[PDB]
Design a protein around this ligand. Sequence first.
Ligand SMILES: Cc1cn([C@H]2C[C@H](O)[C@@H](COP(=O)(O)NP(=O)(O)OP(=O)(O)O)O2)c(=O)[nH]c1=O
Ligand SMILES: [Mg+2]
Ligand SMILES: [Mg+2]
Length: 342
Amino acid sequence: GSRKIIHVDMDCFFAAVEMRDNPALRDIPIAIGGSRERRGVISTANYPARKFGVRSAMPTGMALALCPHLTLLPGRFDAYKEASNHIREIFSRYTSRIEPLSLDEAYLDVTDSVHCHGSATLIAQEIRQTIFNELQLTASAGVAPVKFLAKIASDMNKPNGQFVITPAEVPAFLQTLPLAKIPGVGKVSAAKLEAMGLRTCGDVQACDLVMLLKRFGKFGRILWERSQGIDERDVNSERLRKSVGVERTMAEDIHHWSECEAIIERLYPELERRLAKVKPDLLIARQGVKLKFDDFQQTTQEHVWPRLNKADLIATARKTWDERRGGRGVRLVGLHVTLLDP
DNA sequence: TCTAGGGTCCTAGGACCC
DNA sequence: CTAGGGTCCTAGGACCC
Ligand SMILES: Cc1cn([C@H]2C[C@H](O)[C@@H](COP(=O)(O)NP(=O)(O)OP(=O)(O)O)O2)c(=O)[nH]c1=O
Ligand SMILES: [Mg+2]
Ligand SMILES: [Mg+2]
């Protein structure tokens, strides 16, 4: 049938929390991320900072050259987790059909809801208002028949706005809809499509499905389908973690193995008490290490393993260091597990 | 500018299992 | 009358947050 899906997205999440807890900011360029000292990257920035072009995933050195007066914050994660849990409770007030995508995002299947006369608009509006009141955080929302259009509409009226796409508005909306606006379509994909003369969903509607399946596989099918406005993806609410890892980037050096091992020794206690939280007996289908080199190239080494143990990680990391390092310096060391199925 | 720390899913080359 | 099909490892890419 036709569903009423709602995507909720917190506006400038981290920076919003930090500004909420410190009004001395608010009107100044702030950003959450690591220092150029410790080779950091911007997690997110507030709007005054974005005015200078400060983006997420931007190297802090690049952001400081764009915004010399950028105030750099480290990040208060628990303060984000409380907000996330809170807004999720707020979501649960309206339905059980809830698929959290992160801390500040969630899909809601709100069709069978009898809350605001079956209106997803008033429901989303009330969720945003409730969030505003109970958290002093602002939020934006997308309302759509399917998921990806709810996600797209979620960004069309931010900050503190919501956008609604009706089944009757879908075809007109799809025609001049750039493929890069579709979730799952990043720079590489969009450049591939662009090179193939495809920019919009309307461009894809007049395309051969067989060709798309050839050049992209599943991605081609999904591209064609959502270009048609088809997204049979159902809001899950039973979704679970499929991995946990602990990795770190240094100022650098480490060209010696003892340094890598020391860093592993300092990384393992945390891989423990993060895994212990969601399986006290330390489950594990696979275990592994990751190394990132000075050329920014990285390698991972995992293996079938029955239970978390430091020694094996150290051995594997020794083999990765011995065989794949190639005399290169290492900027990052990482540990990783994979968990089991139910 | 000099590029985090988390995760998701997808593919694929080769190794097994039958 | 040497096994191809399918599943599993496992390393890596693209992507999102
Ligand atoms: C994209 C991104 C986000 N984050 C964190 C910071 C954000 O506060 C949080 C939510 O990400 P988002 O919704 O994609 N970004 P935002 O909410 O801060 O920006 P917007 O207001 O939604 O436009 O995730 C990163 O730590 N690295 C990233 O690359
Ligand atoms: Mg978002
Ligand atoms: Mg957000």
